[PDB]
Design a protein around this nucleic acid. Structure first.
Lengths: 449, 449, 449, 359
DNA sequence: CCGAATCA
DNA sequence: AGATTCGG
């Protein structure tokens, strides 16, 4: 009683694989060299209208009927059963004209880009003519970057880490180590953030201190929903941690933002499985203080220092008109080319995210403790023969140092007053009582081992 | 089994580009020289009925069928895939008869106005005959404005800032610096607000103190939904900040209302991406007090003082019948012409929004502190040779002044009693402890540098 | 494939302009000499059925089909594009039989009333036979009103203000000055309220103290939705303001209820633009106390005193059976005729709403202050030659009087103990500190000018 | 392309006036001698099916089709324009079999009851056989009432006021003076309340202290929404006023519950204008304490004292099995007859509510 | 293939 | 001069 040919048209459309069922139970369409997607409005009908010209005239004429078109859309929905997931590759950069590869630097379009299923995109059309190195904009932006981070051997490690972070901003996979941009106000962090935002378009997203000092998994969370399927996250506006009224960075939150699928409820929808592919960068003017510090957190945190003010390692004047050029996307393609070059230099063929926690006072204190306070163990029991005369008493098969002796000897390596709050917090977090008073921390000095 | 010509009619309609798919997934229509839009009811059918006369009789007759008309509407919906965004230009003033340019003062209509995609409009038809300068209404309104803000050299900067703010009320872009209307009751702020509202019609919107002292991003927020795609916002009814029971202006809220797309959930809809193009003006009778004060906030805030009462820099009598004339829109076109003249004088070709925070007691205190308490740095370490004898002790490579010395010397420049709460709050927000008692603030006097 | 004549019928119907598209995007119909309206159910089909007899038999027969009737309704919806606003005139009184003019006292019906677009109505049919002056009910109601408000020269101003307020209860425009009904319990305020309610039917609406002491703009607000497009509002049940546990009247709320379109979200709908055409009257047994007092509020507030008890300026007995007559609408048309007469006496041709704030203790205190404490200005600087010897010290080009002197001299005009809380609140709201202790209020006595 | 006869059938149905449009924008139907009403589901189709037999066979066959029946319903909706208000008379008592008049005591049914438009009803079928005076249940209930309130000259005023309040519980108009039931615990107030509830069926509604000490007009208010179109409200559970933490009775609330159409937002609906025809009775064991005292409140308050404890003015034994008879509706029609007799004694021809503030 | 029934 | 089915 209906059109048999409509199912044939649906089958032919699904042969092209122009519409796919996402793992989240959503539908995507391949229109205008882009994987367009909208949960609110099914774009299947729009896809049918787009690809009607790619079909015999006997079928394109039938597709003109909205009723028949909706019938074909329903047929496609029914046939599409396997919820095929997307956005697997981390080395492909989508555009409004297709996909650009980060490996060879070759940009794909049309069916070449259709082989890649990218739900999001950079938000603008790709232009290879502007995507060149021998351009005045490229040279100007290189000068700007050198101003922000000098190419000096003292800053060579810091500059290289900054370049690696910027290259990893293009990564489509999880970030295994958080990056901190430390410095003073207007040291180039904001300029770098604006340049990255202009270069990557819709892939950019920024947030404040909310996710860093508050529990994300509490009812709906717009921040987590926005951060899903992203390329880079900027966490600016941190408070004076040394002063009262400022919260500490929650290590639990930092460890939460390190998984491929970070949990968090969206608004009036069930999309808790938020895929985390974004490079999270923290902008601050002060050295952060964390509520909890451990080896895992120190291996999840890297710090980049900005040491050149623009009126430090150097002082220069401020360019007022450069902000307008950034807002005009004059250096967008130059920044993109620089990021591609850095990605090839560093992240080709494998992503690398190494931690640098030694640029934080509390982190440095904990690192020095760990280098000097290796935990007691059964393997350290045979050392009791030499450690008995040094105050270390064997308590429950553990080499234990008295709290008084520990506090006396911790003033030799650390300032007992500068680290007084830090030392007290570390003790309270790691002290144990023998009976009531022979308080000990299950750590051993290497000076006595 | 249906009409093949219906798709041809849809194609011809979309050739005219009379209907566009917004970035928010909404549909707009170009009817009666206006970009009409309604999410609740799709105006596509109404657009088809409007433009049926612009089509051959073979097609206009077919469009008379509501079923065929809905079929063509569905075809248009399917063909429209690219969610083209609108309202880009900040220099175009829409009307019910078309678009008026702020650059050359030329008003466009019909297809000339169709080139511009304005979702909102002034809410009334444009009239060039009333849009003249050599009119009695223009002279009367100029006299009224001079009464509100005298053309005196003492008030010349204040008057010019007020004129710049009024001209920027026509801006279709983000406001980079909040404006404060400070004064006493009935000093002309309400008259100016009413004149602007009558001049700009639907583009006007006003709000209370809710957005200034409360967190906007908390579930649904009607205020943010209303403020989207606006031209000017008035924030009146501020409390006595010096007295108890009155909240402080949240600097976080002020910084939130400074982005092109301010977040905030509407009512039973997903339009969190609220575009902010409105000039936010704050009406108050008292000098505001902020919970947090920083350089960014002071660069985001400007203050305009009203110094002429109407029974100050001058005192005059009250005109009871002027309110009726304002409500009758007698000076609507005169006010519009004055705003166009001011926009050409100031904002042509580029918008300018400079901060004036020095008209606020706490802001003035913080500005004087910043001029006198430049933060310590490594660049200031070589000054330790001269600063050691002046009480500045080098602590962790930071030039640190004792809290006692800081409090003693802050009474020389500031009244230690008048600013006692302010000084204490600043210290608590910016003090750091050396060990327990050598409390310091990482700032250096210039009298000793 | 459908009926071409259906569009012709729709065109003919829209020629009559029997259905109009409101500014709020709603549809109204002109049925039974009334502009019926319902957002929940479109009355267009009912209008088509009503006016089918006003069409040729070739069309009335076609309109009998519900499918064709719905088709014509959709055609009318599509053709109706201009969202024409309604309820402009304030001088027209709608009825269930048409519209009564307040200017000439002539009642219109049918197409004469169709020229007027009134969304609301009095809720009952008009009867000119009962709308007469030479009736026993009119004389009885005149006696009742004279009992409530004596026709005495002492109360002549109060009686005239009461009559003006009652006449303005018929106004279809914004009320520029709030009215207060002050007195004791059962002084005639409730009787007047009941008489007005019976006279005006659906146009009446009453509310409690919620809108006076609470913030209206907080999510949904049924009160604002009900008050829209109304003629009169009664705010009764005020607490003992001098005693604890009673909130103060928010001046912000009072100023909010003074605009043609008062904001406020309805329930599960977007009708925030609530048109305010109602005469707001406050019923209380105590003199109100406001959280904030200013010149604008005092110019927005009028007070009417009821000085005749019914067991004051006179004491009479209570009529138990008069309440039944009021509930039977016996004096409805007499009250309507009296209101029309008062409107012609006072509000013809222009509405007049003058403030009388001098009947409130705090308001009287502030009025006396303003008469005695004119604010200092540059125009008052030349008076410093005579004011220096009187304690007025010129501080920052402002004539400043010490707080001690101000408190000493404020006890001469005001009772420093009776107004002690009022004087202290005024000082705290208006005091300024020279350095810490030469506290001043920027106001000057006229005894020294 | 439809049938012409459907509009004619709709016109004929509307001639019978079996369906009416309420003032609240709702529809009511006259089925089984009752003005049935439902906003959730339009009962128009059911009414058409019911009255298809009252029509020529040429039309009943057409009405059998649900689609044609819905079409006729749409026609009726289009033709129904005047939102005629209903339930005006305060002297008519609706039932499931019709309406009983409080003036002459005559019960109406069918088209006689159709002339009366009652959205609500007593919730049970009327029975004149049980509605008689010479019944053992009537005598037993008279004894019970005399126990609750003695027929003594000392309590003659209190007894008469109590009888007037019980008679006014059947009033369909506004209550101009609130009535208080003062005394101690289990003095007979609960028994009288249960008897009234059993007698009046659905027309009864009972609440606690919420509406007496709190602000009614604050967002949705299910209590006020339920109180609409009611005949009597019982407000029990008043706390000890002397003890701290117990709120006082708000005079504003009392004045609010004295208008024909008391405001208040229902839940997810627009029924703010709630008609108030209910005789509000407050059950308490302490002398009331009010936030404000004034003549109007004193002119709005009536006090009835219960002075007979059932283990005061009398002390009698407890009848445990009487509650079972009450719940079995044994004294329902006897109580109804007593209420009608009291209404004729007091409220014929005019309702009367006189305050007693001196108590 | 035309008409009627069934009809978005 | 819904389309589509069923009947002629």
């Amino acid at each position: 009683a209906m059109g048999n040919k409509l199912f044939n048209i649906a089958q032919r459309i699904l042969d092209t694989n122009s519409v796919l069922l996402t793992e989240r139970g959503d539908y995507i369409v391949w229109i205008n060299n882009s994987w367009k997607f909208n949960s609110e409005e099914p774009l299947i009908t729009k896809l049918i209208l787009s690809i009607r010209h790619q079909l015999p005239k006997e079928y394109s004429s039938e597709l003109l009927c909205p009723r028949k078109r909706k019938t074909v859309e329903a047929n496609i929905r029914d046939m599409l059963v396997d919820s095929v997931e997307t956005d697997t590759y981390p080395d492909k950069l989508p555009f409004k004209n297709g996909v650009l590869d980060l490996v060879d630097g070759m940009f794909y379009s049309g069916d070449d880009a259709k082989k890649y299923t990218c739900t999001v995109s950079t938000g603008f059309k790709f232009d290879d003519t502007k995507f060149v190195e021998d351009s005045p904009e490229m040279e100007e932006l290189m000068n700007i970057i050198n101003d922000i981070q000098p190419l000096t051997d003292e800053n060579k490690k810091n500059r290289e880490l900054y370049e690696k972070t910027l290259s990893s901003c293009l990564c489509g996979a999880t970030k295994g180590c958080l990056t901190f941009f430390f410095g003073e106000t207007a040291t180039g962090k904001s300029t770098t953030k604006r340049l990255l935002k202009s270069a990557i378009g819709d892939l950019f997203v920024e947030t404040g201190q909310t996710i860093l000092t508050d529990v994300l998994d509490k009812g709906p969370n717009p921040f987590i929903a926005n951060m899903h399927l992203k390329r880079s996250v900027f966490c600016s506006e941190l408070p004076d941690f040394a002063c009262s009224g400022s919260k500490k960075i929650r290590s639990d939150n930092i460890k939460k933002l390190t998984e491929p699928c970070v949990i968090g409820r969206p608004c009036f929808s069930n999309k808790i499985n938020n895929r985390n592919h974004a490079t999270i960068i923290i902008d601050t003017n002060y050295k952060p203080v964390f509520d909890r510090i451990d080896n895992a957190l120190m291996r999840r945190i890297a710090v980049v220092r900005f040491r050149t003010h623009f009126s430090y390692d150097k002082v220069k004047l401020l360019d007022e008109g450069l902000d307008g050029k950034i807002q005009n996307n004059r250096y967008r393609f130059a920044f993109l080319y620089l990021l591609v070059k850095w990605y090839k230099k560093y992240h080709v063929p494998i992503m690398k995210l190494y931690p640098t926690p030694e640029e934080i006072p509390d982190f440095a204190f904990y690192l020095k403790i760990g280098t000097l306070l290796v935990s007691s163990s059964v393997k350290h029991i045979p050392l009791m023969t030499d450690l008995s005369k040094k105050g270390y008493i064997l308590y429950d098969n553990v080499v234990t140092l008295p709290l008084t002796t520990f506090q006396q000897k911790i003033s030799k390596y650390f300032n007992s007053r500068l680290f007084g709050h830090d030392i007290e917090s570390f003790i309270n977090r790691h002290k144990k009582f023998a009976n009531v008073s022979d308080e000990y921390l299950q750590y051993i000095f290497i000076e006595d081992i």
